[PDB]
Design a protein around this motif. Structure first.
Motif, mmCIF file in Angstrom:
data_model
loop_
_atom_site.group_PDB
_atom_site.id
_atom_site.type_symbol
_atom_site.label_atom_id
_atom_site.label_comp_id
_atom_site.label_asym_id
_atom_site.label_seq_id
_atom_site.Cartn_x
_atom_site.Cartn_y
_atom_site.Cartn_z
ATOM 1 N N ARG A 384 0.858 -1.215 0.000
ATOM 2 C CA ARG A 384 0.000 0.000 0.000
ATOM 3 C C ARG A 384 0.884 1.252 0.000
ATOM 4 O O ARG A 384 2.121 1.123 0.161
ATOM 5 C CB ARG A 384 -0.932 -0.005 1.215
ATOM 6 C CG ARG A 384 -1.842 -1.223 1.293
ATOM 7 C CD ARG A 384 -2.508 -1.377 2.647
ATOM 8 N NE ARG A 384 -3.489 -0.331 2.914
ATOM 9 C CZ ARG A 384 -4.351 -0.321 3.932
ATOM 10 N NH1 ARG A 384 -4.374 -1.310 4.813
ATOM 11 N NH2 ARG A 384 -5.198 0.687 4.062
ATOM 12 N N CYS A 385 0.264 2.422 -0.172
ATOM 13 C CA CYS A 385 0.947 3.729 -0.359
ATOM 14 C C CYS A 385 1.801 4.065 0.875
ATOM 15 O O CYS A 385 1.220 4.231 1.971
ATOM 16 C CB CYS A 385 -0.071 4.827 -0.637
ATOM 17 S SG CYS A 385 0.703 6.383 -0.871
ATOM 18 N N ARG A 386 3.122 4.191 0.688
ATOM 19 C CA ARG A 386 4.109 4.513 1.761
ATOM 20 C C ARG A 386 3.741 5.847 2.419
ATOM 21 O O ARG A 386 3.828 5.940 3.662
ATOM 22 C CB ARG A 386 5.536 4.651 1.221
ATOM 23 C CG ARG A 386 6.076 3.446 0.465
ATOM 24 C CD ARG A 386 6.183 2.183 1.281
ATOM 25 N NE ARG A 386 6.870 1.148 0.519
ATOM 26 C CZ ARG A 386 7.006 -0.120 0.898
ATOM 27 N NH1 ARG A 386 6.514 -0.540 2.052
ATOM 28 N NH2 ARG A 386 7.634 -0.976 0.109
ATOM 29 N N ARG A 387 3.375 6.844 1.605
ATOM 30 C CA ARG A 387 2.996 8.209 2.065
ATOM 31 C C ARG A 387 1.742 8.122 2.945
ATOM 32 O O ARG A 387 1.760 8.699 4.050
ATOM 33 C CB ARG A 387 2.777 9.153 0.879
ATOM 34 C CG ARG A 387 2.435 10.586 1.271
ATOM 35 C CD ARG A 387 2.428 11.574 0.116
ATOM 36 N NE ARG A 387 3.492 11.301 -0.840
ATOM 37 C CZ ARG A 387 4.734 11.777 -0.789
ATOM 38 N NH1 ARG A 387 5.120 12.612 0.163
ATOM 39 N NH2 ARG A 387 5.598 11.420 -1.723
ATOM 40 N N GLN A 388 0.698 7.432 2.466
ATOM 41 C CA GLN A 388 -0.609 7.274 3.166
ATOM 42 C C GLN A 388 -0.376 6.666 4.557
ATOM 43 O O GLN A 388 -1.004 7.154 5.510
ATOM 44 C CB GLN A 388 -1.575 6.413 2.347
ATOM 45 C CG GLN A 388 -3.006 6.413 2.880
ATOM 46 C CD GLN A 388 -3.985 7.144 1.991
ATOM 47 O OE1 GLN A 388 -4.296 6.713 0.882
ATOM 48 N NE2 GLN A 388 -4.508 8.254 2.487
ATOM 49 N N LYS A 411 5.594 9.807 -8.730
ATOM 50 C CA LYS A 411 6.537 10.508 -7.816
ATOM 51 C C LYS A 411 6.189 10.263 -6.336
ATOM 52 O O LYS A 411 7.005 10.691 -5.495
ATOM 53 C CB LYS A 411 6.572 12.001 -8.165
ATOM 54 C CG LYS A 411 7.293 12.312 -9.472
ATOM 55 C CD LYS A 411 7.448 13.784 -9.775
ATOM 56 C CE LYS A 411 8.444 14.039 -10.890
ATOM 57 N NZ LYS A 411 8.501 15.469 -11.274
ATOM 58 N N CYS A 412 5.069 9.594 -6.008
ATOM 59 C CA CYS A 412 4.616 9.398 -4.598
ATOM 60 C C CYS A 412 5.527 8.384 -3.898
ATOM 61 O O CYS A 412 6.295 8.792 -2.995
ATOM 62 C CB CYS A 412 3.163 8.947 -4.483
ATOM 63 S SG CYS A 412 2.677 8.653 -2.795
ATOM 64 N N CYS A 413 5.443 7.115 -4.301
ATOM 65 C CA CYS A 413 6.199 5.999 -3.684
ATOM 66 C C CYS A 413 6.273 4.799 -4.632
ATOM 67 O O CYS A 413 5.518 4.772 -5.632
ATOM 68 C CB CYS A 413 5.582 5.600 -2.345
ATOM 69 S SG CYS A 413 4.004 4.840 -2.507
ATOM 70 N N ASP A 414 7.166 3.858 -4.314
ATOM 71 C CA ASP A 414 7.419 2.601 -5.070
ATOM 72 C C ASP A 414 6.110 1.825 -5.276
ATOM 73 O O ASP A 414 5.951 1.222 -6.354
ATOM 74 C CB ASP A 414 8.487 1.741 -4.384
ATOM 75 C CG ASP A 414 8.185 1.287 -2.961
ATOM 76 O OD1 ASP A 414 7.205 1.776 -2.363
ATOM 77 O OD2 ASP A 414 8.949 0.448 -2.452
ATOM 78 N N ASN A 415 5.207 1.842 -4.290
ATOM 79 C CA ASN A 415 3.933 1.075 -4.326
ATOM 80 C C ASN A 415 2.916 1.778 -5.232
ATOM 81 O O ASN A 415 2.120 1.059 -5.869
ATOM 82 C CB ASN A 415 3.385 0.832 -2.918
ATOM 83 C CG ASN A 415 4.221 -0.157 -2.133
ATOM 84 O OD1 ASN A 415 4.988 -0.931 -2.710
ATOM 85 N ND2 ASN A 415 4.095 -0.136 -0.816
ATOM 86 N N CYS A 416 2.917 3.114 -5.271
ATOM 87 C CA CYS A 416 2.076 3.923 -6.196
ATOM 88 C C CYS A 416 2.610 3.861 -7.634
ATOM 89 O O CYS A 416 1.796 4.081 -8.551
ATOM 90 C CB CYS A 416 1.975 5.377 -5.757
ATOM 91 S SG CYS A 416 0.909 5.494 -4.373
ATOM 92 N N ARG A 417 3.909 3.595 -7.828
ATOM 93 C CA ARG A 417 4.527 3.431 -9.174
ATOM 94 C C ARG A 417 4.067 2.099 -9.777
ATOM 95 O O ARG A 417 3.548 2.091 -10.892
ATOM 96 C CB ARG A 417 6.056 3.498 -9.116
ATOM 97 C CG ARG A 417 6.606 4.908 -8.972
ATOM 98 C CD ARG A 417 8.098 5.018 -9.230
ATOM 99 N NE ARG A 417 8.369 5.454 -10.600
ATOM 100 C CZ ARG A 417 9.061 4.788 -11.532
ATOM 101 N NH1 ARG A 417 9.614 3.609 -11.284
ATOM 102 N NH2 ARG A 417 9.210 5.326 -12.734
HETATM 103 ZN ZN ZN Z 1 2.233 6.359 -2.663
#
Ligand code: ZN
Ligand code: A1CEZ
Length: 417
Positions: A384-388, A411-417
């Motif tokens: 899941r999203c690292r930022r979230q 640009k958010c995180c590896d999981n969003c990529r």
């Molecule tokens: Zn993310």
């Protein structure tokens, strides 16, 4: 939610929060400020981007202990709005000024009010009143909102703030919570000096940090193989893309890692507990001067670095926990330009070793440390999203609403990529 706070709020603190503020839990930063005020009587500079989750930090402590808290602010309408909210929550509160004094001042002196809002203009005339309240009641804290207004060097100077330097003269044992929206290291230092704060706790929250890319990657164990992807080969030597910090879990690793980067003739240096203050100073100075490019370090390095152009943070080994990790990635890209934060972890990382925590004899502390290690391991293992995850644990719900732009993008995180 209560399980990730050290020390844990007691049951009466949770009951107080629910009854008077309608909240089920403290966010870590809120608890950080409240506990430091209540138990350590510690000065705070609390940088807060917005008013979301802000007021609780200075409203909760005097309500819990049933004493008095002072809120010094120039924002008259916001002070009136907060006075009404406190009244409607059955917390006795008022605006104290020359025009209001006849109505409220006898009642304030008799200890009938939990929270008193005053202008900085009123406060400089009435240090004698504060001394009386300190003697008769005991002042839990003084909040100075818009604390940046004390700095001539900032954009919104107020002459009324100049005399707030006397608070620590008049009341040396009352902790001051200085609050501002500005994350300038320059203005923080002005606030600390001008309010004569003693070893203040510095926190910075309410920001979404869209310029920080988050990635978690498996560690091979071969140091050169692991770090090769980050390097750029110049005619002279290999080097990182910009100013870099590599946080390692032990002193044995900081030496190993620096040794492998040394072989590449990379401009770097080691930092840890067991080095000369003179050498630690020139490392800090060289890094600020951009004379060394990278710094390989323990949890020891970073506090008061003030360096705005850290392009890359690498955790070579799983971080201590999510609190240390949050502090460490927070130092990346303060200039607001694109930065990347990578964790390089293996299952054999010391900070995922339960055996050492199983041996801790204090039960409450043992169960805190295991809960923090497991929360860390759940972050590292996540798809899941690292930022979230980070915003959900540390930041108010408002920060997540603002951050929906960056979140989900490449640009958010590896999981969003
Ligand atoms: Zn993310
Ligand atoms: C003097 C002193 N005494 C004690 N300690 C330190 C120290 O070494 N530190 C204290 C401050 C930390 C801790 C938190 C944090 C710090 C920080 O300097 N800035 N600067 C910003 N910017 C600057 C540019 O404008 C916009 C805001 N914001 C912060 N923040 C919050 C933050 O970064 N929140 C966050 C959000 C998302 C994510 C993601 F991963 F989900 F995207 C991660 C985080 Cl951490 C740094 C450490 C000190 O200097």
């Amino acid at each position: 939610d209560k399980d990730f706070l050290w020390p844990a709020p007691n049951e009466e603190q949770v009951t107080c929060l629910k009854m008077y503020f309608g909240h089920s839990s403290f966010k870590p930063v809120q608890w950080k400020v409240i506990h430091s005020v209540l138990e350590e009587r510690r000065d705070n500079v609390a940088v807060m981007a917005t008013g979301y989750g802000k007021s609780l930090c200075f409203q909760y402590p005097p309500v819990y202990v049933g004493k008095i808290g002072l809120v010094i602010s120039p924002l008259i309408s916001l002070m009136e709005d907060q006075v009404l909210q406190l009244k409607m929550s059955n917390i006795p509160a008022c605006f104290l000024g020359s025009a209001q004094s006849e109505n409220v001042l006898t009642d304030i002196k008799l200890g009938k009010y939990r929270i008193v809002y005053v202008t900085p203009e009123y406060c400089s005339g009435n240090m004698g009143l504060l001394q009386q309240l300190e003697a008769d009641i005991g002042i839990t804290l003084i909040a100075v909102d818009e604390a940046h207004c004390i700095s001539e060097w900032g954009h919104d100077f107020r002459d009324s703030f100049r005399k707030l330097g006397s608070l620590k003269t008049a009341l040396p044992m009352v902790p001051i919570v200085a609050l501002t929206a500005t994350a300038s290291s320059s203005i923080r230092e002005d606030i600390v000096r001008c309010l004569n704060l003693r070893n203040p706790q510095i926190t910075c929250t309410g920001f979404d940090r869209p310029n920080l890319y988050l990635e978690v990657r498996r560690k091979t164990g071969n140091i050169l193989q692991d770090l090769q992807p980050f390097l750029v080969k110049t005619s002279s030597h290999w080097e990182f893309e910009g100013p870099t910090i590599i946080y390692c879990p032990s002193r044995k690793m900081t030496q190993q890692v620096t040794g492998e980067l040394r072989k590449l003739n990379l401009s770097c240096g080691t930092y840890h507990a067991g080095m000369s203050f003179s050498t630690r100073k020139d490392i800090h100075h060289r890094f600020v001067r951009d004379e060394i490019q990278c710094v390989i370090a323990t949890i020891a390095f970073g506090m008061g670095i003030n360096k705005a152009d850290i392009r890359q943070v690498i955790h070579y080994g799983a971080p201590k926990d999510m609190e240390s990790y949050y502090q460490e990635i927070g130092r990346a890209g303060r200039d607001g330009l694109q930065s990347s934060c990578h964790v390089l972890w293996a299952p054999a990382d010391i900070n995922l070793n339960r055996h050492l925590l199983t041996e801790i004899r204090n039960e409450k502390f043992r169960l805190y440390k295991l809960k923090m290690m497991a929360k860390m391991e759940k972050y590292l293992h996540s798809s899941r999203c690292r930022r979230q995850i980070i915003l959900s644990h540390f930041e108010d719900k408002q920060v997540q609403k603002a951050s929906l732009g960056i979140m989900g993008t490449e640009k958010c995180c590896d999981n969003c990529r």
